[PDB]
Design a protein around this ligand. Structure first.
Ligand SMILES: [Mg+2]
Ligand SMILES: [Mg+2]
Ligand SMILES: [Mg+2]
Ligand SMILES: [Mg+2]
Ligand SMILES: [Mg+2]
Ligand SMILES: [Mg+2]
Lengths: 71, 98, 129, 83, 218, 129, 208, 83, 23
RNA sequence: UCAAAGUUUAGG
RNA sequence: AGGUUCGAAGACGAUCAGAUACCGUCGUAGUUCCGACCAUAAACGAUGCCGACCGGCGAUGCGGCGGCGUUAUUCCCAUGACCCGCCGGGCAGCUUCCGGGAAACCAAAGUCUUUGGGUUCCGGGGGGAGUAUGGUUGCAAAGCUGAAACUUAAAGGAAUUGAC
């Protein structure tokens, strides 16, 4: 079971520390990784110039063209 | 799901057993596993027994018997119908048939 | 190993009460055990017990009366600061009406209510109701 | 049950097993209240008044009811010193 | 018209037992649904919590039949939680109501701290669980309301529990199991053996004894 | 290779015989006509069939009792033959046999009546594994 | 029971018990029944404290007597020893018998033809008469039962330690239970003997 | 079951326990005052001897110490009575 | 099959070790 | 007292 | 060092549309012994280790204790082999409304919302992936440690009715 005792604090708090990385949402937000992969460099929106109107094709159970813009 | 408390393999307190080559498929099997008929059997059988009793020299005479321990593996045991399958309840009856 | 004695004693009497016993024999014994059990007696949860001296640790036999729901123990023996005792009794007893939190103190072993009266924090031990 | 005024409340007050102080529930349908008749002393012969004992549904199914009943009798002087 | 085919029912019809509190006391099972409706005439209201449609597979397509979780309660000390499955939903609901009626139970209620007025919240922190879904009720102070999920809130209201803090864990989403858990919690509210009890019991006759001369009907 | 009687025959036959045991007999055509009068059997074929089984139970009855039927005279005969009382067996003459383990039994309850004491049997080894 | 003066042992009763052999129990002792035993003999047969038997037998009576209308003491045998005895007991006592093939749910189903809601059951052999015993836990039905060494004491509120195997002892026990429910209350002396023979209650294995 | 006087257990069910599991942990063993036939000196042997006990005159051997209680040499009587 | 996908992967790793040892 | 028997609209 | 048997590779014979496979005939490494590596398996009870308590029943293996009768050996002794007990701790079993559990099941997987005996390891939708990358170990084969982008609404367990 758990470490539980009274001068454990370190083991307890450090074990939590090591595990927090196994969380998915947290590793996203703490390894820089995703901010690097964001085109919107950690941003709510981004201005960008259109350079071709591209029809996207929808995923199977729906059939439809989705008219996107290459920015 | 775990089909049997046993695991069809009466082991328990060992963690290794010597194998057995099956007396049919030649398959390898744990000894603690594997269906095992012991077959004592009159050599001559019902048909000729009286024919040989007639035409034996030795007066009266008790014949012999043929003694064989088989070692059927699971696959083969079921095929030859040494052992049928059973309902989940009837699986837990380790008395033999008569 | 046999690490904390109190914690197995109370567990022994809680197991007994659960199966509907009349008396129950708790094996290694202590001051603390006898002080905890007496507190449980003063509020009528367990009946009058006795403490068999072998010339060693000792044993204790305790007569129950089916009033004792759960009698537990808090390891570690955290150090409750009287301010904090309200929180404990919220998240440890079943109601603001019965149940006790026995915490050892300068002043001695007792339930929380005596400790609040005597205005004396001290380390937690367990609880019963 | 009483409120702070001393006025009783709570729509009833449950029975409670004679052999475990264990409150016999609203819907414990394996319970028993068992009337056991007394006698006059000089003649035997059922004498009006009873001795009653409730038992929880748990104890019965545990298989411990008859020992517990037998113990309750011999406290109350129905039964007479089995030894 | 009611022709009671039980012993208990016959007594109730003859105004012999004055309250269903007497029936509860001796754990005599209520079998006939007329007894309960008689004793709780009005106040008793039936709220269809959910209609889950089940089904099962035939060689010939599939059989589909419905399942009506009814609760029932006086908003004043008694609640039931009947379930019934039928080929057509109205029949499931009519049967569900009757099954709730057969398993209404006397909810204890308690005070919070200061013990004044009439009991309003729950006694001790009772819990009740069923098939993963655990429901924990917690006694709460006046005017809080029922801090709870929809299903329990509707059943707890029916019990007549003005104030309650609640927790749950498990697949609460299984409405039936979540109602059945909350039911087991408020079932237990009486069977918690507080000091408030403890007093050695009296023991009385039980209607089957008292009116055995009436039941040998003359 | 076929003709079993249905339940709709068997029942009618059974119920007929309960009531009109006396009228009915061994010959078929006799009771075939009895079946007509006492019972409103619709089809002639059904009648003919009920009667046919009715003979067959009559034959069975004339040779001990049948399980699924109540003939009034047989029940009265059963009542006379299960309220028998001989000169009594639970006294078991004078001299009842007893063991030393069942002697001492009596010494605990204070007795010394006419009962012969005898054992030898050394613990054999009960059943076989 | 109160084996205090009037309803004490007497020689003539013990001698009947010994003849039937209700003391001579079985080989398999269940840990509930240990309570009601003197010893185990040679071979392996336990012996049943006949005082202890009496006391329990008397208790059962005081329970059956407290039942204020005798007809709502149900009495049951599934086995072919008690079927006659329970029938004669019910005649003697004024009870209702359920001799043979107890229909599952006579104590449940409002609906049923053979619906009954008694205040007490009196079992023969709780090992065999097990369906009614369990139904006695859906209804709030206390129980008497003639238990052997083996007989496990599930649900039985007041066990009578006997030789429920042998038909004699079975009969004898029923006849004894009848005497004392009759004697306590009814139209029997105790000083005088009883007109009814115990041979009445015994099962007749096809003989004539 | 459901009720056992743990403080007043009967001696028929204390001797049938383990030497440690009794209410007060006792021993199962004893000293014996061994006589022997020739040499009149009465030795004082312990039931579980483990040593091979030679006499005080040192002529004979008293006990061949087995696993259990020691094996006394044929004509060698003895008395418990103590403590 | 899992076992064979491991063999696949261990052979392909072996090919990658071999490519990179050319530099 | 064990031959061979692979496949199955995108078009709801 | 050795090489009977079997037998990856390989070679033929069959079977098949095909069979580089299953069946048959050969047959290398290996299969064995000695001396060095390797360090992984469904290395499984898929169940960490110590400690406590909480129901029955029969069995079995070791040690001890007690007991009337057997076999005997020779005339008792000592026996040893049976017999019926109890104790301690073993491998397991059946049994139950112990109590758990999503359950199947488990006297443990119980004594958990009435949550705290101690302490280790360890998981956090499914894939990518035990991949890449470094570091390290190995003669090697490999092992240990071990990401990410990108992808995706499920994948998964137990159990029910069907169909096959
Ligand atoms: Mg292995
Ligand atoms: Mg080949
Ligand atoms: Mg591994
Ligand atoms: Mg686990
Ligand atoms: Mg926890
Ligand atoms: Mg993941």
């Amino acid at each position: 079971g758990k470490c539980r005792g009274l001068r454990t604090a370190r083991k307890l708090r450090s074990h939590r520390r090591d595990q927090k990385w196994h969380d998915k949402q947290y590793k996203k937000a703490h390894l820089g990784t995703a901010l690097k992969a964001n085109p919107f460099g950690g941003a709510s929106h981004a201005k960008g110039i259109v350079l071709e109107k591209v029809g996207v094709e929808a995923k199977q159970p729906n059939s439809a063209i989705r008219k996107c813009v290459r920015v | 799901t775990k089909k049997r408390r046993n695991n069809g393999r009466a082991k328990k307190g060992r963690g290794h057993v010597q194998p057995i080559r099956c007396t049919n498929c030649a398959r390898c099997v744990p000894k603690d596993k594997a269906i095992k008929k012991f077959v004592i059997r009159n050599i001559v059988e019902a048909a000729a027994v009286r024919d040989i009793s007639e035409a034996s020299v030795f007066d009266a005479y008790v014949l012999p018997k043929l003694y064989v321990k088989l070692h059927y593996c699971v696959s083969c045991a079921i095929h030859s119908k040494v052992v049928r399958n059973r309902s989940r309840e009837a699986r837990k009856d380790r008395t033999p048939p008569p | 190993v046999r690490m904390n004695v109190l914690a197995d004693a109370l567990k022994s009497i809680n197991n007994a009460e659960k199966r509907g016993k009349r008396q129950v024999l708790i094996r290694p014994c202590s001051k603390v055990i006898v002080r905890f059990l007496t507190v449980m007696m003063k509020h009528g949860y367990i009946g009058e017990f006795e403490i068999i001296d072998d010339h060693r640790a000792g044993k204790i036999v305790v007569n129950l009366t089916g009033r004792l729901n759960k009698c537990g123990v808090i390891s570690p023996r955290f150090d409750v600061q009287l301010k904090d005792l309200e929180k404990w009794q919220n998240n440890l007893l079943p109601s603001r009406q019965f149940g006790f939190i026995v915490l050892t103190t300068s002043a001695g072993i007792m339930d929380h209510e005596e400790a609040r009266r005597k205005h004396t924090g001290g380390k937690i031990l367990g609880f019963f109701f | 049950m009483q409120n702070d005024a001393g006025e009783f409340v709570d729509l009833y007050v449950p029975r409670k097993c004679s052999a475990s102080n264990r409150i016999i529930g609203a819907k414990d349908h394996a319970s028993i209240p068992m009337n056991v008749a007394e006698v006059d002393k000089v003649t035997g012969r059922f004498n009006g008044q009873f001795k009653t004992y409730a038992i929880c549904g748990a104890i019965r199914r545990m298989g411990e009811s008859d020992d517990s009943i037998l113990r309750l009798a011999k406290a109350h002087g129905i039964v007479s010193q089995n030894f | 018209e009611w022709l009671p085919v039980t012993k208990l029912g016959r007594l109730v019809k003859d105004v012999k037992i004055k309250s269903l509190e007497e029936i509860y006391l001796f754990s005599l099972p209520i079998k006939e649904s007329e007894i309960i409706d008689f004793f709780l005439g009005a106040a008793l209201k039936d709220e269809v919590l959910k209609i889950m449609p089940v089904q099962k597979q035939t060689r010939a397509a599939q059989r589909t039949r419905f399942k009506a979780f009814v609760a029932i309660g006086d908003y004043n000390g008694h609640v039931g939680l009947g379930v019934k499955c039928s080929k057509e939903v109205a029949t499931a609901i009519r049967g569900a109501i009757i099954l709730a009626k057969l398993s209404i139970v006397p909810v204890r209620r308690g005070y919070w701290g200061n013990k004044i007025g009439k009991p309003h919240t729950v006694p001790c922190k009772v819990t009740g669980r069923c098939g993963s879904v655990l429901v924990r009720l917690i006694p709460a102070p006046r005017g809080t309301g029922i801090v709870s999920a929809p299903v329990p809130k509707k059943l707890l209201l029916m019990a007549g529990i003005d104030d309650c803090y609640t927790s749950a864990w498990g697949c609460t989403a299984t409405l039936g199991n979540f109602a059945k858990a909350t039911f087991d919690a408020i079932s237990k509210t009486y069977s918690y053996l507080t000091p408030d009890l403890w007093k050695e019991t009296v023991f009385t006759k039980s209607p089957y004894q008292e009116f055995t001369d009436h039941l040998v009907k003359t | 290779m076929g003709r079993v009687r249905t339940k709709t025959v068997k029942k009618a036959a059974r119920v007929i015989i309960e009531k009109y045991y006396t009228r009915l007999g061994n010959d078929f055509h006799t009771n075939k006509r009895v079946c007509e009068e006492i019972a409103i059997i619709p089809s002639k074929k059904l009648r003919n069939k009920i009667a046919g089984y009715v003979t067959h139970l009559m034959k069975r009855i004339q040779r001990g009792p049948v399980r699924g039927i109540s003939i009034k005279l047989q029940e009265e005969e059963r009542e006379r033959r299960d309220n028998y009382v001989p000169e009594v067996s639970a006294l078991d003459q004078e001299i009842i046999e007893v063991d030393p383990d069942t002697k001492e039994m009596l010494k605990l309850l204070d007795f010394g009546s006419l009962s012969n004491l005898q054992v030898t049997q050394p613990t054999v080894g009960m059943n076989f594994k | 029971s109160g084996a205090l003066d009037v309803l004490q042992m007497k020689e003539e009763d013990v001698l009947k018990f010994l003849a039937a052999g209700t003391h001579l129990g079985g080989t398999n002792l269940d840990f509930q029944m240990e309570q009601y035993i003197y010893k185990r003999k040679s071979d392996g047969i336990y012996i049943i404290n006949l005082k202890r038997t009496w006391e329990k037998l008397l208790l059962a009576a005081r329970a059956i007597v407290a039942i204020e209308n005798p007809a709502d003491v149900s009495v049951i045998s599934s086995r072919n020893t008690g079927q006659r005895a329970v029938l004669k007991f019910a005649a003697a006592t004024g009870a209702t018998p359920i001799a043979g093939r107890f229909t599952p749910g006579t104590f449940t189903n409002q609906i049923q033809a053979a619906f009954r809601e008694p205040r007490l059951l009196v079992v023969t052999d709780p090992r065999a008469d097990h369906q009614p015993l369990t139904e006695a836990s859906y209804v709030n039905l206390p129980t008497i039962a003639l238990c052997n060494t083996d007989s496990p004491l599930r649900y039985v509120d007041i066990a009578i330690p006997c030789n429920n195997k042998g038909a004699h002892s079975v009969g004898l026990m029923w006849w004894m239970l009848a005497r004392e429910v009759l004697r306590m209350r009814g139209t029997i002396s105790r000083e005088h003997p009883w007109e009814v023979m115990p041979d009445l209650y015994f099962y007749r294995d096809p003989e004539e | 079951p459901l009720a056992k006087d743990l403080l007043h257990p009967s001696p028929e069910e204390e001797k049938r326990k383990h030497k440690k599991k009794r209410l007060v942990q006792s021993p199962n063993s004893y000293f014996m005052d061994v006589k022997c036939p020739g040499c009149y000196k009465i030795t004082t042997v312990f039931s579980h001897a483990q040593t091979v006990v030679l006499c005080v005159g040192c002529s004979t051997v008293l006990c061949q110490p087995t696993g259990g209680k020691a094996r006394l040499t044929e004509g060698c009587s003895f008395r418990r009575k103590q403590h | 099959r899992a076992k064979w996908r491991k063999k696949r992967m261990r052979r392909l790793k072996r090919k990658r070790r071999k490519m990179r040892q050319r530099s």
